[PDB]
Scaffold this active site. Structure first.
Site, PDB file in Angstrom:
ATOM      1  N   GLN A 175      39.057   1.418 -37.251  1.00 10.26           N
ATOM      2  CA  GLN A 175      38.879  -0.029 -37.285  1.00 10.26           C
ATOM      3  C   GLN A 175      39.375  -0.627 -38.601  1.00 10.26           C
ATOM      4  OE1 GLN A 175      34.946  -1.465 -36.081  1.00 10.26           O
ATOM      5  NE2 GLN A 175      34.799   0.222 -34.608  1.00 10.26           N
ATOM      6  N   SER A 180      38.301   5.415 -40.866  1.00 10.45           N
ATOM      7  CA  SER A 180      37.903   4.446 -39.861  1.00 10.45           C
ATOM      8  C   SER A 180      39.133   3.867 -39.177  1.00 10.45           C
ATOM      9  CB  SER A 180      37.067   3.325 -40.485  1.00 10.45           C
ATOM     10  OG  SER A 180      36.899   2.251 -39.571  1.00 10.45           O
ATOM     11  N   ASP A 215      32.741  11.757 -28.677  1.00  4.82           N
ATOM     12  CA  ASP A 215      31.948  11.055 -27.674  1.00  4.82           C
ATOM     13  C   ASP A 215      31.633  11.914 -26.458  1.00  4.82           C
ATOM     14  OD1 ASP A 215      31.595   8.426 -28.809  1.00  4.82           O
ATOM     15  OD2 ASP A 215      33.724   8.055 -28.416  1.00  4.82           O
ATOM     16  N   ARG A 259      25.612  -5.649 -39.777  1.00  4.31           N
ATOM     17  CA  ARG A 259      26.637  -4.652 -40.107  1.00  4.31           C
ATOM     18  C   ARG A 259      27.572  -5.088 -41.247  1.00  4.31           C
ATOM     19  NH1 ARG A 259      26.312  -0.792 -36.553  1.00  4.31           N
ATOM     20  NH2 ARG A 259      25.498  -1.109 -34.432  1.00  4.31           N
TER      21      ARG A 259
END
Length: 441
Positions: A172, A170, A319, A124
């Site tokens: 993150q 993102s 999700d 990744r």
């Protein structure tokens, strides 16, 4: 090589349940408790793959931590400058989230560090977080042309705040930038092109740090100190969603889900089910650990209606759509999902399983069309049963598990061993509600 199996038949679905803690919030509480002044007591904790890696990293960096045990963790924070150099590389396993957030944190420390991951994480790229950190003055190295792990960070740098226009949204990358900014000179600011989750920002505020959220511009000023506190982790709404759907498709269902996190960046499933005519109330609202929580009361008092799902809820329900697909199948009329181009091809995998159970549905380039078999006031079976491949996707497995509430034939779901990792008490709560699931290997 594990599987769930469910027998057909009329089932009850009722009770007052509390699902496991939110994984993101559980993780953030370790991040900030470790570097806060004084001890932090966490309750309702759920140790996922992200928590385990981060827990171990801070232990390797000298932080004394009790637990987790029975959802409880005690963190003896060491202050903003109390971290100690790790003796060796910090192993992140499969936790990309850990690696990206700790990239920001570690790039501000006095000591050097190396982060490594398993076979999957080694593939990744990390340049989307590395690039902005280097603009702040970070010395951070990646591997190869794709900039994959290991990530090698040289400490001893003086960071300065930047004004970053995030190329790709993102939570993150945003978080990582903000975390480095805690030690940086001046203000660090991230502007995101699409809305993302804000569990990081909310947890920072809980630890007493000032974080400005001004539209899509999120910023803080470096040099502050985090303060240890008591953190009550909200239960995961992504987990609660399965029982929301389960109640909405089962005749006379009566389910109360307690202390469900209702962060506005997470509540898409509630809005969509509400728009589908679900009997779903949100009451007893309060705030715990900077997160909003509430009790969700769902009743199978009427039949869901198929709708064109609101696009403005897609980021907020990303999700939960595997679960909503089950609701849609039981709904009256056609359902259409658009703008969900970013769905493991969960749409294709869901469509495959749905088609096996006799549901007319059609994957599209930005979503799916589902022909509901529901009829108002009719609670006959919707699904024909069959054998389902979950592709080891816990959300796929748990979704088709709910289909067992409205099946005329046996359901067998393959590849369910990941469910317990995501939702430890899933089969337990299912049984307690009236949905017997047999597990075998």
């Amino acid at each position: 090589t594990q599987q769930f199996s469910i027998l057909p038949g009329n089932k009850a679905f009722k009770g007052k349940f509390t699902v496991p803690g939110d994984k993101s919030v559980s993780h953030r509480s370790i991040m900030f408790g470790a570097i806060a002044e004084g001890t932090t007591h966490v309750t309702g904790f759920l140790e996922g793959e992200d928590a385990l890696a981060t827990l171990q990293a801070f232990r390797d960096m000298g932080v004394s931590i009790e637990g987790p045990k029975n959802g409880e963790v005690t963190i003896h924070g060491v202050g903003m400058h109390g971290l100690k150099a790790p003796a060796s590389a910090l192993y992140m396993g499969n936790s990309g989230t850990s690696m990206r957030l700790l990239s920001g944190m570690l790039s501000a420390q006095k000591f050097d560090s190396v982060m490594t991951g398993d076979a999957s994480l080694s593939k990744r790229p990390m340049e989307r977080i590395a690039k902005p950190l280097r603009l702040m003055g970070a010395q951070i190295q990646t591997t190869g042309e794709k900039g994959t792990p290991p990530v090698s960070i040289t400490g001893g740098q003086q960071l300065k705040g930047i004004q970053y226009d995030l190329p790709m949204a993102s939570a993150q990358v945003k978080s990582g930038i903000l975390l480095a900014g805690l030690w940086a000179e001046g203000e660090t600011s991230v502007t995101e092109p699409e809305p993302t989750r804000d569990h990081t920002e909310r947890m920072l505020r809980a630890f007493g740090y000032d974080v400005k959220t001004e539209g899509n511009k999120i910023s803080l000023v470096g040099g502050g100190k985090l303060v240890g506190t008591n953190i009550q982790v909200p239960s995961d709404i992504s987990s609660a969603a399965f029982f929301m759907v389960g109640a909405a498709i089962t005749e006379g269902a009566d389910v109360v889900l307690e202390a469900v996190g209702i962060n506005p960046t997470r509540t898409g499933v509630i809005e969509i089910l509400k728009q589908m005519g679900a009997d779903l109330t949100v009451e007893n609202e309060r705030i715990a650990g900077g997160e909003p929580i509430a009790d969700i009361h769902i009743k199978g008092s009427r039949t869901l209606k198929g709708i064109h799902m609101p696009e403005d809820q897609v980021p907020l329900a990303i999700d939960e759509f595997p679960a909503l697909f089950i609701a849609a199948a039981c709904a009256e009329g056609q359902t259409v999902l658009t703008g969900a181009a970013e769905l493991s091809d969960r749409i294709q995998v869901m469509a495959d399983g749905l088609k096996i159970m006799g549901i007319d549905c059609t994957p599209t380039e930005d979503g799916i069309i589902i022909e509901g078999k529901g009829k108002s006031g009719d609670w006959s079976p919707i699904f024909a049963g069959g054998e389902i491949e979950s592709h080891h996707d816990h959300r796929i497995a748990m979704s088709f598990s709910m289909a067992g509430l409205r099946t005329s034939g046996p359901i067998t779901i393959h590849g369910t061993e990941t469910v317990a990792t995501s939702f430890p008490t899933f089969t337990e709560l299912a049984n307690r509600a009236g949905l017997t699931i047999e597990v075998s290997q």
